[PDB]
């Protein structure tokens, strides 16, 4: 504003903020159990085992 005497004024304001977050988790598991048993009382010296 200026009248009989001059007066000067000036102001400025600016602010900026940016936040960020990122997370990712991955997991994988697997289990398999296979057992085979064979008992033969056949009566041959070789063929029973064969």
């Amino acid at each position: 504003y200026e009248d009989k005497i001059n007066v000067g004024g000036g102001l400025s304001g600016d602010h900026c903020k940016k936040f960020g977050g990122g997370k990712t988790e991955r997991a994988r598991k697997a289990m398999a159990v296979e057992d085979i048993i064979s008992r033969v009382r056949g009566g041959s010296s070789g063929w029973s085992g064969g």
Partner: protein, 49 residues
Amino acid sequence: KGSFRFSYSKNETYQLFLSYSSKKEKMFLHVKGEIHLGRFVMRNRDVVL
């Protein structure tokens, strides 16, 4: 006459990134087989040498 001027500017950029991975596998096993032929029973007492 009078004229004053001022200018200020700031600028910031940060970035962070982290990654981790692990994989494991295990397999231990055993197999066996026997083909028997004949069994004997040695006499305990009254033995010849």
